[PDB]
């Protein structure tokens, strides 16, 4: 009973068995059918020699025969089926199968072991295999199951356990998404995956659970996931020292996965599922402060609007199913043109089928994008914690309508109602949100109304009909809105949950990183000259159509909304950071104590600063990649699957003098507004006269500098 002796005997037996296998294989090759003539020779000496020298083969065959006999008995017992092929007795069967050695003819122990070892070898995996089969599904399922199981098992996973588990899952998901983003956007790669036959929806119909990873899906998915990764990293610092941080983290993960499922939906049933899931998870995030009933009122407002949108979407899907006996998104997109000519007989009116379907879709899209009239819930949804607010308002909850329009664009291209309604409502919402945000005094409310304005601009861009411009606008707005939301969240946490900047002043020194990060993020968000966010508005005005009947109102509202960005950006930044100290004495004194002076001193989190920095860097890189893909001379974007060409790119490639000078009007309007917000004095100061003098110096120097640059050189 020695382990060393057992191992040595096992190794010796392995070598003997391998040698016997090789010998039998060679002899079998030589004597395919005549091997028995020598193996089973009647000679006693030869029989004994063969048995002794092939004992490992014989014992292995005996064990295999016993195992096969027992397995066949078990199968017969369980299935009440047949016999062991034949009714051979136990003795006859075992003797025959043990004497038979042909089972080893193609078997080599070393080769088999090597195959088993190399089966798990990871060197083999290649990009080509990944390109053939998408690993995005494997990582998304990982993230989903991690979130679900973490929700269920909270006691097992403490604060740190939940954070680390979900961080690993989300990082893997984001890296895979990043890998496939390059292929889908430019290389014309898209996948249609099916998990199975989900449900039966008619007498003989059964819809499968399918996902569509296309350019339209990936544009939203990658943006949401990239924003969510850094929001997740930031939340652990924002909700620092809170009773319930795991709950908030898991709610954020749930909302992210719900939005990902919605955007990457293969059929209307999955789309509706994702729609309801984002609604429910947004409700939970808004109602996070469950103890308070004041929060429940805002949550219930959002819930009612979401249920109305669900009604509209469900009715539209029912109309589509009744018309075409199909719920597949691709099939519907490629079939809708045939049924365009059809009408539906309703109560007393014959409504055009496309018009009614597009009416319901646009209604639900407006409700979820917080357009004018249906936006009443968005200002009240700010009761959620800042990470949840950023995620919902950047690219997750308020872009659902934009995703719907982009995915079902072939439908709306043949919609008279869409043509009339999208530009008017978009421009009105843009103007309303911009002006209200400019006049707003609270940080979260300002960001919410700015989000409403940018959603209006997105609607107007879709009305223009350049899906590339819409996608660029969506990406820019989402990234920079999220970054600004994180910055204001740090500011609010420092200011002790007081979100109004009337009590904020001189925070530049107390939050140095937030000041500069907010400066960059706001100049990019509010379309300002010489910034990454100027081109989105420039392209929107390039593509704006002029055949509308309400074009005067549409254009005036668009101009006012576009200019409104400057006021809110300036007010937010200046009032928060560089205005006179208006906050309570405690806020400043508690942090100005000399004892706190240390290398570790900070009023924010190092992880939060790093998360914001990485978010800004990645947003810049991705926006540049999209700009190169679309706005470059060589068009390298993937197919959008739309046959409607707007001609808008003509005024981007070869603009005429008329349009070039027309854009200057808005440019100079913005310039005058900047001069007003900078040099305008509302309060007496020691620097009133010197401020007027500086304005005079700037005007005269600008004139002379222009003279020298243009003429004197």
């Amino acid at each position: 009973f020695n382990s060393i002796l057992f191992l040595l005997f096992f190794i010796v037996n392995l070598y003997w068995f391998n040698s016997g296998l090789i010998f039998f294989n060679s002899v079998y090759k030589i004597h395919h059918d005549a091997w028995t003539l020598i193996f089973q020779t009647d000679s006693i000496l030869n029989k004994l020699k063969i048995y002794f020298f092939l004992l490992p083969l014989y014992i292995s065959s005996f064990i295999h025969s016993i195992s096969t006999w027992y397995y066949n008995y078990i199968l017969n017992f369980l299935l009440f089926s047949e016999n062991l092929n034949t009714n051979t007795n136990f003795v006859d069967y075992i003797t025959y199968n043990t004497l038979l050695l042909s089972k080893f003819e193609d078997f080599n122990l070393f080769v088999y072991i090597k195959t088993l070892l190399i089966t798990f070898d990871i060197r083999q995996i290649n990009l080509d295999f990944l390109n053939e089969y998408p690993i995005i599904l494997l990582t998304g399922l990982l993230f989903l199951f991690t979130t679900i199981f973490s929700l269920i098992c909270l006691s097992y996973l403490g604060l740190y356990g939940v954070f680390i588990l979900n961080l690993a899952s989300i990082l893997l998901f984001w890296l895979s998404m990043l890998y496939y983003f390059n292929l889908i956007v430019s290389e014309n790669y898209y996948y249609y995956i099916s998990l199975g036959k989900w449900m039966y929806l008619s007498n003989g119909f059964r819809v499968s659970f399918d996902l569509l990873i296309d350019l339209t899906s990936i544009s939203f998915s990658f943006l949401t996931l990239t924003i969510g990764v850094f929001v997740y990293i930031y939340t652990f610092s924002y909700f620092r020292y809170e009773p319930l941080v795991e709950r908030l983290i898991l709610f954020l993960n749930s909302f992210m996965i719900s939005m990902i499922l919605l955007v990457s939906s293969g059929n209307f049933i999955v789309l509706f599922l994702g729609w309801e899931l984002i609604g429910l998870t947004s409700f939970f995030l808004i109602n996070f402060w469950s103890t308070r009933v004041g929060t429940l009122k805002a949550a219930f407002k959002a819930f009612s609007f979401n249920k109305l949108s669900d009604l509209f979407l469900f009715f539209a899907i029912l109309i589509i199913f009744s018309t075409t006996y199909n719920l597949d998104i691709l099939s519907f997109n490629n079939q809708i043109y045939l049924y365009e000519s059809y009408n539906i007989d309703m109560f007393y009116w014959s409504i055009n089928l496309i018009e009614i379907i597009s009416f319901f879709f646009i209604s639900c899209a407006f409700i979820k994008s917080a357009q004018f009239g249906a936006h009443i819930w968005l200002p009240d949804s700010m009761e959620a914690p800042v990470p949840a607010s950023a995620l919902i308002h950047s690219a997750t909850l308020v872009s659902a309508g934009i995703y719907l329009l982009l995915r079902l664009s072939p439908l709306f291209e043949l919609s008279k109602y869409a043509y009339f309604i999208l530009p008017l409502i978009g421009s009105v919402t843009a103007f309303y949100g911009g002006l209200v945000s400019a006049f707003q005094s609270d940080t979260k409310k300002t960001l919410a109304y700015s989000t409403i304005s940018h959603c209006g601009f997105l609607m107007v861009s879709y009305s223009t009909g350049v899906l590339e411009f819409v996608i660029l606008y969506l990406y820019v707005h989402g990234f920079f809105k999220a970054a600004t939301f994180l910055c204001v969240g740090n500011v609010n946490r420092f200011n002790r949950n007081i979100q109004d900047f009337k009590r904020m002043g001189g925070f530049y020194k107390y939050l140095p990183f937030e000041c500069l990060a907010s400066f960059v993020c706001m100049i990019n968000l509010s379309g300002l000259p010489l910034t990454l966010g100027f081109y989105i508005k420039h392209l929107l005005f390039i593509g704006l159509v002029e055949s509308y009947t309400l074009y005067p109102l549409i254009f005036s509202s668009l101009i006012l909304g576009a200019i409104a960005g400057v006021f809110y950006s300036y007010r937010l930044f200046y009032s928060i950071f560089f205005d006179t100290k208006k906050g309570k004495k405690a806020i400043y004194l508690q942090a100005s104590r000399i004892i706190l002076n240390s290398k570790f001193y900070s009023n924010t989190s190092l992880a939060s600063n790093l998360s914001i920095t990485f978010l800004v860097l990645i947003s810049y890189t991705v926006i540049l990649y999209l700009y190169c893909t679309t706005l470059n001379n060589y068009y390298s974007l993937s197919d959008l699957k739309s046959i409607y060409i707007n001609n808008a790119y003509s005024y981007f490639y070869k603009p005429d003098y008329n349009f070039l000078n027309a854009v200057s009007i808005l440019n100079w309007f913005v310039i005058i507004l900047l001069i007003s917000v900078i040099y305008l004095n509302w309060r007496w100061s020691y620097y009133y006269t010197k401020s007027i003098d500086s304005l005079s110096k700037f005007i005269l120097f600008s004139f002379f500098f222009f003279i020298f640059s243009k003429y004197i050189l």
Partner: protein, 46 residues
């Protein structure tokens, strides 16, 4: 079931082949994905 797309000629196919295009052909499931594969069952046992 019957062909839906309009037909093309064998001469046109040969012209495309000379130009360097390839005929799309579905590929068999790899051993890892194939559910009737020794690799698949070794993975299951592991």
């Amino acid at each position: 079931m019957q062909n839906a797309y309009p037909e093309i000629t064998d001469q046109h196919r040969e012209f495309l082949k000379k130009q360097g295009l390839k005929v799309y052909e579905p590929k068999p499931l790899p051993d890892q994905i194939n559910p009737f594969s020794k690799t698949y069952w070794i993975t299951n046992a592991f």
